[PDB]
Design a protein around this nucleic acid. Structure first.
Ligand code: SF4
Ligand code: ZN
Ligand code: ZN
Ligand code: ZN
Lengths: 189, 103, 538, 99, 146, 512, 97
DNA sequence: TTAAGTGGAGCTGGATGCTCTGT
DNA sequence: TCCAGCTCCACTTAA
RNA sequence: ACAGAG
């Protein structure tokens, strides 16, 4: 479900690390700058996948470190629209249902895309669903959060960059839907 | 305190009534005494008002309005044939147009 | 969780493109509008005013009071601009000779450039060739303006275009109505008789009307230059992405940050010029309301042009006697130009630290590559030795001795920190134990340091050479007299300079390239200069 | 040869140097320091920071001397290293769907 | 000045007399050449009428009103044509006589004044991205409301 | 012309879009260029440049010529881009002289740029079906019958023709065919025997090929010039006198240059038969009008002859100078008030004048006149002569004669107009873009009514439209429309000012 | 500062500069005439080429193009004296590679 | 006869060494 | 205190 | 601003 992103960078290798093969030292110094961070237009970087090319290791004047331009590919969790995923409920809230996908927690099920039978919680945090035959409106998305299946209808990037001179909002947002048949808790289908 | 130039060469022969010191800068949109003339109305001047709005809505739909091409669509899907933006194409008269412009 | 951001975007300057700001880009840079003439409040609190010059929204030039825009001290702040609005346009004195040039090329009636279709086609294709250099542009401007001056009628509107020339300090005149002994031309004959209302009431018009001409002025030339077609702007050799003809006439003026003009010179001459500009802008604005005569308004405008021009360049030649400054003042041009200006005094050469000076005296028991440095200079001139596996146990002993014993150290600095611990205080035997790799110990100058050595007048490269220091008790600098001939030194109370290179790369370039053993022969004829002298020849 | 390489005998005066040297900041750091800076504003000239004098002004190391060459570190490196094969998204299993 | 609060009422009073007299000929509609002649007033009759109204104790001397009527020309409200003094009740100039008639303006007010831009005092400062912009102008935000 | 290029950028974006306004503005700003560097200076791909250039040449907005070594250079026609703004006034004025068929002819010619005579009579017939009902077709005969009447009146004219390759230069094909205009056949229509009917949008080889036709914009300006002169005479003299002027100008149409100081003279003997029969005027009274017009110091007419009875010419240039001055005085009056407009007409008649004479002549006191005088300098309505006593030019020893120059103040005032329209468009587009949220929302509710309008459409959908939360929002959409309708209407009305000022500037230039 | 009374220091003149060029000593000339006098950092916006502050460009009202350049302070001073003269030094910065 | 291209003469603006050491 | 460019004005050729 | 020193 992931993608590769082809990226370039100039990596500074300091001179105490000259006792190590360069392809090992470069990869470590790249994971330290990319892992668990969102790169704006492309998504959340998991780790470096491989180095595809490695240019000349210049030494610039006034420093002793070596600078080398690296060509590399990185595994990034970018899910395409209308994809099916499975994940666990962390919380119920008035604004909707919040889903976790392992590492990723900013998954929104909006109430405009929830199941139609029940749509306004009666002063309760937990969301509800009513079926006439079974369960009299007490069926619920439990706080323990047994895995739901959801379909990612929308995603948005918000540019979390400094405004004004210098001297926490979620930068990657994902919006699901659950209204289709076959979506929901796994035990329902 | 005196300045570099002599103030008597500018004026002020009496020795008083120098202009005051501006404290706050003047506002960006100062108030004006005069107002615009109200518009011309009529059965003929309003028909030009409606024809002007019908030329925007038509010339955006006519084939001369070359829209910018889309790119970097992520994946292919079966909803591509259902969502293909169909529009007929105009062709010029290549006698008048130069040879250097054939597509 | 967090978004990626690059940590430290170091970049390299690729080129400087010069240009000029439009009056409405000035308003977009500047943080405040300046309107008040008074430097300081009248009351004893000694605050500056909120919307006058010396306002701390434009930065600070004293540690006592911080900048308002970014809340940061003198050491941290780059400075910020304000602007002054000018009620009437003025010529910029640096661009004035270029203002006339354009008015000699453009038609004064429709603002098209006075060239035929063929000459326009020619020069526009000259300006296409890749790699057009600065000299070729200056030559092309001459040939373009040459043709425009030999034409007297416009190909586009047909109006007559006489000579444009200077007519005194910051004034321009256009000879639209020349007159000749021949049969009188139609259009000039209409103008000469239009004066009928003036002649009825003013007798003196009738001699002087032969000398009546179009007095070009900033209110007109700003209105012409807005109307020049953008197709014809490249043929004036103006680059249309660095500026426009409209920008050459200043209707707005930036005031520099306070750190350009520090608070105790009290105020700098730029700050007092800007007061006078603001005052005269209030004089002119009031006289328009109170009904002064045109003789007064024009004179005041003439003052505003002078005060702006003397703000930029205070050495103007043609200043009338009833307008001349009583005192000399630094304009911007005077602090750029000359021996004590920026380019010679502060940019090409500058005062440097880790330097010393003393009387020189002989010592033949030193080698020719050595120089004796007194202990009093060696305890001051420190070299930053980076701590590593080869020198850790050596630098510990130097840290223990501390500032007062000669093989010692004045400062210690931790790995990723930029403050410096002054090693005179604290217990040095504890600070020696807590040395880590990557710390910097600022040790004293010791035997075997590469040190630069230079007599004050330098006529050739051998007047500055690198020597290995050796520390000795007496105060003078000392070297073997075989090296007197390169320095032209004579030990009669002569003084010489010493520089301690603060970088490992600067040691190597000094040692390999500038060492005395590498410089036994002069570059000129290849003859030896370090050799025997008197009492070594006898 | 410096005096005659442009076909005319050019002096070592400010006038000869203005015909030999293109750089504004070099020209402005010798004589007529005001006029050269206003002309560069008018012409919109861009200045190559390559020359010796403007390198010392801008604080960058000059090309001549020790600046003419670059140093590479002789690290133990393998350029164009072995790539990880993809398993899924290879071309032989994914012939296009549409005609 | 003579008196600024004095001339301002005489300015309209003279034009009302010329407007009245022009209205008589337009209502007469007998013969357009004769009607054009009838549309002119005498330079002496307008003075003798204004001084007879009795606005002020000071006498409205003919040598002043002869130059006051020029202000109605520069407001664009009246024409003046000199005629030879072939016949006239006084003939106030040797061989010459002066006629006055009210006239309409040449054209209605233009299109630029109808737009707010035509009257703006900060027109030189207004730009797309600036502090003063059409997208944030107060002169348009007011004038579009009524 | 930075105001012109800013205004041209908006017009091309609204009528043609983003990847063609880039090429259009670049041609206006730089002048003529070969094709390869149009792409390189812009960064557009070569295929998009060809698409952009071919649409701009279709609507006659760029020309092309062959040059040395056979390269084509394109060249933008700046004034013809601005005349896209006057298109509704053209479509209205054809509806005044001609029926609704003549309205739809000019609409198709202006929107497609060039059409063949067969193509226009087809597309006018198709579109006029919506104006009619109950079986009656539009037929191609009554379309062409108006087109040939449009042609004779010169409102429509043939485009420059391709040359006959067989007659001239047979051989290797040229890079561009070097088109030329033929003066004989501009107003000579092809004859068409084919007829037919317009299709009512049910949705369930060509003889005049190469005879392209386009609107003759210069003929509309000769119409609008007449209306400015005729209406000025209608105010000053009488409606009857205005008709006499309208009679002279309508005869002048076919036999005079669109740029000349004087038209062809006509005798009063031949004016008499041309005036409509309802005007109960004798020939002798007609000569009373003509002398009283010629007596006017505005001099809209003059004598210029004596043969065949009374001879009279109407002055084209001198009428425009009056109208440009009346335009120039009217903006002074509204911006600074009547007392300042007094001073403007004073200095204009007393051609050079000083402050002490201005207060004397206008009966405006000091500290009120001088404030008005000094503002008129700073807005470039008025000038200083500055006759010197000495070659010092010192302010203490010179007499500052004021002057008004009409030509420079007309060019200055025109520059204010181009920026004024650009501002009005910028306000409309700002308020349209910032309400795209509500405009989509108000579309989608109406889309529920438009889509599935009749087939299977139950009545149970008509109330669910106002059930959305957009019902309170509606107050904003009434404010939107009243804003846009005032901004659009002012964008039309400032064009009345441009045409008056530009026609004066157009005629004083000889372009020698 | 200027001299012995003020613990001033010593001058590397225009003539000593000419000596060091003739040795080809490019890094020593950088150490003496930048690092041990007036080393500084400025925020430069890569879009407009003007100087900014604190990683913010007031001209553009954006934060993303700004970058740090190592510059002598006297040149920063020159680049602000010249802008007040309305001679604008618009910089362009490449990466250091 | 005069339009015009080029000689000769006067006006204008630029420049004139490197540092410390004190009052 | 010494020295290049810029502009004004007489001085032949040429139609 | 003046005097020194090399
Ligand atoms: S401020 Fe607004 S209303 Fe006034 S001229 Fe500018 S855009 Fe027009
Ligand atoms: Zn600050
Ligand atoms: Zn012209
Ligand atoms: Zn910026």
């Amino acid at each position: 479900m992931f993608v590769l992103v082809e990226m370039v960078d100039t990596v500074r290798i300091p001179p105490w690390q000259f006792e190590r093969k360069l392809n090992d030292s470069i990869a470590e110094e790249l994971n330290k700058k990319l892992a668990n961070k969102v790169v704006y237009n492309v998504g959340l970087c998991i780790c470096l996948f491989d180095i595809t090319k490695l240019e000349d290791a210049y030494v610039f004047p006034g420093d002793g470190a070596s600078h080398t331009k690296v060509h590399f590919r990185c595994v990034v969790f970018h899910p395409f629209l209308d994809e099916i995923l499975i994940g666990k409920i962390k919380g119920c809230s008035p604004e909707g249902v919040h889903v976790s996908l392992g590492f990723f927690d900013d998954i929104l099920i909006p109430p405009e895309s929830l199941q139609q039978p029940a749509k306004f919680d009666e002063a309760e945090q937990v969301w509800v669903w009513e079926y006439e035959t079974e369960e009299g409106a007490h069926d619920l998305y439990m706080d323990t959060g047994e895995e739901i299946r959801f379909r990612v209808v929308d995603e948005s990037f918000v540019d979390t960059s400094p405004t004004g001179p210098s001297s926490k909002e979620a930068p990657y947002t994902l919006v699901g839907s659950i209204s289709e048949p076959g979506l929901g808790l796994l035990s329902w289908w | 305190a005196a300045y570099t130039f002599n103030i008597e060469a500018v004026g002020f022969s009496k020795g008083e009534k120098l202009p005051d010191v501006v404290l706050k800068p003047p506002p960006l949109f100062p108030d004006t005494d005069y107002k615009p003339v109200p518009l011309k109305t009529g059965e003929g001047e309003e028909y030009m008002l409606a024809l002007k709005q019908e030329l925007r809505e038509t010339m955006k739909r006519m084939p001369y309005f070359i829209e910018t091409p889309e790119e970097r669509q992520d994946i292919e899907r079966y909803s591509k044939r259902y969502m293909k933006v169909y529009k007929e194409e105009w062709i010029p008269d290549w006698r008048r147009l130069p040879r250097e412009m054939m597509p | 969780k967090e978004q990626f951001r690059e940590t430290d975007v170091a970049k390299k300057i690729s080129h400087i493109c010069f240009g000029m700001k439009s009056p409405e880009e000035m308003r977009q840079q500047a943080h405040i509008q300046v309107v008040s003439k008074n430097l300081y409040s009248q009351d004893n609190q000694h605050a500056p005013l909120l919307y006058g010059v010396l306002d701390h929204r434009m930065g600070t030039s004293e540690k006592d009071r911080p900048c308002e825009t970014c809340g940061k001290n003198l050491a941290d702040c780059l400075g910020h601009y304000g602007y002054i609005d000018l009620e009437l346009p003025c010529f910029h004195v640096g661009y004035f000779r270029a203002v006339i040039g354009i008015l000699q090329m453009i038609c004064k009636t429709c603002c098209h450039i006075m060239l035929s279709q063929e000459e326009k086609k020619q020069f526009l294709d000259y300006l296409k060739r890749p790699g057009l250099t600065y000299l070729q542009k200056r030559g092309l401007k001459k040939k373009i303006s040459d043709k425009c001056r030999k034409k007297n009628i416009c190909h586009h509107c047909g109006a007559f275009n006489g000579t444009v020339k200077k007519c005194g300090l910051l004034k321009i005149i256009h000879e639209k109505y020349k007159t000749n002994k021949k049969v009188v031309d139609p259009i000039v004959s209409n103008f000469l008789q239009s004066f009928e209302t003036a002649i009825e009431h003013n007798k003196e018009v009738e001699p002087l009307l032969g000398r009546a001409q179009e007095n070009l002025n900033p209110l007109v030339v700003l209105n012409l230059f807005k109307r020049i077609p953008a197709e014809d702007v490249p043929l004036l050799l103006m680059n249309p992405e660095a500026g426009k003809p409209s920008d050459l006439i200043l209707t707005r003026l930036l005031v520099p940050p306070l750190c350009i003009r520090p608070s105790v010179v009290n105020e700098d001459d730029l700050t007092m010029k800007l007061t006078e500009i603001i005052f005269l802008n209030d004089v002119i604005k009031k006289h328009r309301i109170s009904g002064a005569k045109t003789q007064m308004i024009m004179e005041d405008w003439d003052f505003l042009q002078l005060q702006c021009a003397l703000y930029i360049n205070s050495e103007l030649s043609g200043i009338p006697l009833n307008m001349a400054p009583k005192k000399w003042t630094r304009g911007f041009v005077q602090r750029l130009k000359g021996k004590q200006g920026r380019f010679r005094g502060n940019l090409s050469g500058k005062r440097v630290d880790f330097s010393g000076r003393t009387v020189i005296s002989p010592d033949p028991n030193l080698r020719i590559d050595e120089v004796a440095v007194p202990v009093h200079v060696a305890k001051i001139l420190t070299f930053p030795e980076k701590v590593n596996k080869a020198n850790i146990n050596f630098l510990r002993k130097l840290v223990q001795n501390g500032p007062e014993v000669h093989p010692g150290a004045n400062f210690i600095q931790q790995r990723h920190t930029q403050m410096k611990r002054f090693l005179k205080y604290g217990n040095r035997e504890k600070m020696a134990q807590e040395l880590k790799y990557g710390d910097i110990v600022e040790r004293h100058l010791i035997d075997g340091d590469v040190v630069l050595f230079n007599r004050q007048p330098s006529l050739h490269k051998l007047s500055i050479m690198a020597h290995l220091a050796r520390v000795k008790p007496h105060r003078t600098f000392r070297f073997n007299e075989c090296v007197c001939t390169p320095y032209n030194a004579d030990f009669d109370g002569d003084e010489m300079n010493l520089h301690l290179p603060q970088t490992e790369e600067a040691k190597a370039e000094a040692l390999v390239l500038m060492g005395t053993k590498a410089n036994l022969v002069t570059p000129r004829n290849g003859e030896p200069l370090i050799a025997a002298i008197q009492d070594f020849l006898t | 040869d410096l005096m005659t390489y442009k076909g005319e005998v050019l002096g070592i005066t400010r006038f000869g140097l203005a015909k030999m040297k293109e750089s504004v900041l070099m020209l402005a750091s010798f004589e007529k320091t005001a006029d050269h800076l206003f002309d560069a504003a008018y012409f919109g000239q861009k200045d190559s920071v390559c020359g010796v004098s403007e390198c010392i002004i801008m604080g960058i190391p000059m090309n001549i001397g020790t600046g003419l060459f670059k140093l590479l570190h002789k690290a133990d490196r393998d350029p164009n290293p072995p790539k990880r094969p993809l398993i899924f998204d290879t071309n032989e299993f994914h012939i296009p769907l549409v005609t | 000045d003579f008196e600024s609060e004095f001339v301002e009422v005489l300015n309209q009073q003279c034009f009302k007399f010329l407007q009245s007299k022009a209205e008589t000929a337009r209502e007469s509609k007998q013969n357009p050449m004769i009607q054009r002649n009838s549309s002119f007033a005498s330079s002496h009759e307008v003075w003798k009428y204004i001084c007879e109204l009795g606005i002020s104790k000071v006498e409205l001397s003919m040598e002043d009103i002869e130059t006051i009527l020029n202000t109605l020309i520069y407001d664009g409200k009246v024409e003046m044509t000199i005629i030879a003094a072939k016949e006239g009740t006084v003939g106030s100039v040797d061989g010459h006589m002066k006629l006055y008639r009210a006239v309409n303006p040449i054209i209605p007010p233009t299109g630029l004044v109808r737009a707010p831009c035509g009257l703006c005092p900060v027109f030189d400062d207004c730009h797309e991205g600036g502090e003063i912009s059409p997208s944030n102008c107060i002169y348009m935000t007011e004038w579009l409301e009524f | 012309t930075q105001a012109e290029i800013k205004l041209c950028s908006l017009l091309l974006q609204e009528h043609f879009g983003e990847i063609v306004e880039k090429i259009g503005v670049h041609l206006i700003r730089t002048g003529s260029q070969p094709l390869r560097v149009i792409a390189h200076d812009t960064g557009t791909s070569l295929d998009q440049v060809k698409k952009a250039l071919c649409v701009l040449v279709q609507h006659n907005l760029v020309s092309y010529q062959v040059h040395k070594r056979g390269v084509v250079e394109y060249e933008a026609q700046c004034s013809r881009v601005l005349r896209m703004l006057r298109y509704p006034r053209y479509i209205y004025t054809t509806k005044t002289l001609y029926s609704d068929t003549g309205e739809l002819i000019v609409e198709e010619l202006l929107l497609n740029g060039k059409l063949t005579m067969s193509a226009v009579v087809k597309k006018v017939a198709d579109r006029l079906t919506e104006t009619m009902e109950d079986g009656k077709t539009m037929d191609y005969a009554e379309v062409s019958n108006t087109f040939v009447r449009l042609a004779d009146t010169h409102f429509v004219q043939r485009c420059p023709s391709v040359p006959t390759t067989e007659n001239s230069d047979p051989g290797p094909p040229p890079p561009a065919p070097t088109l030329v205009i033929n003066e004989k056949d501009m107003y000579l229509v092809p004859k068409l025997s084919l007829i037919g009917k317009g299709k009512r949008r049910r949705s369930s080889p060509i003889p005049d090929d190469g005879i392209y036709w386009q609107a003759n914009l210069d003929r509309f300006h000769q119409h609008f010039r007449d209306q400015a002169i005729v209406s000025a005479v209608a105010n000053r003299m009488d409606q009857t006198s205005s008709e006499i002027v309208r009679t002279m100008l309508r005869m002048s149409e076919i036999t005079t240059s669109s740029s000349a100081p004087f038209t062809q003279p006509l005798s009063s003997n031949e004016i008499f038969r041309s005036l409509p029969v309802g005007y109960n005027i004798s020939k002798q009274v007609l000569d009373q009008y003509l002398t009283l017009l010629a007596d006017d110091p505005l001099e809209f007419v003059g004598k210029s002859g004596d043969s065949g009875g009374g001879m009279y010419v109407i002055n084209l240039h001198k009428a425009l100078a009056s109208l440009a001055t009346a335009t120039l005085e009217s903006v002074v009056q509204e911006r600074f008030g009547s007392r300042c407009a007094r001073i403007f007409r004073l200095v204009l008649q007393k051609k050079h004048i000083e402050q002490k004479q201005v207060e004397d002549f206008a009966m405006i006191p000091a500290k009120e006149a001088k404030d008005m005088l000094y503002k008129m300098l700073s807005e470039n309505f008025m000038s200083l002569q500055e006759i010197p006593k000495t070659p010092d030019h010192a302010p203490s020893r010179t007499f500052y004669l004021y002057t008004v120059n009409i030509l420079s103040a007309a060019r200055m005032l025109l520059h204010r107009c181009y920026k004024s329209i650009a501002n009005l468009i910028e306000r409309r587009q700002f308020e349209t873009k910032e309400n795209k949220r509500l405009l989509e929302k108000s579309q989608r509710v109406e889309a529920i009514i438009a889509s599935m309008q009749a087939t299977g459409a139950e009545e149970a959908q008509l109330q669910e439209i106002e059930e959305m939360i957009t019902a309170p929002e509606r107050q904003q959409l009434e404010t939107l429309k009243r804003n846009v309708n005032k901004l659009d209407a002012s964008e039309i009305q400032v064009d009345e000012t441009i045409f008056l000022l530009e026609s004066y500037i157009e005629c004083t230039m000889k372009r020698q | 500062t200027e001299g012995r009374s003020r613990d001033g220091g010593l001058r590397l003149g225009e003539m000593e500069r000419d000596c060091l060029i003739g040795y080809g000593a490019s890094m020593l000339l950088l150490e003496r005439l930048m690092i041990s006098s007036d080393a500084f950092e400025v925020d430069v916006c890569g879009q407009c080429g003007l100087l900014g502050y604190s990683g913010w460009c007031h001209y553009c009202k954006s934060s993303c193009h700004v970058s740090s350049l190592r510059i002598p302070y006297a040149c920063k001073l020159l680049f602000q004296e010249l802008q007040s003269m309305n001679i604008i030094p618009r910089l362009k910065l490449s990466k250091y590679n």
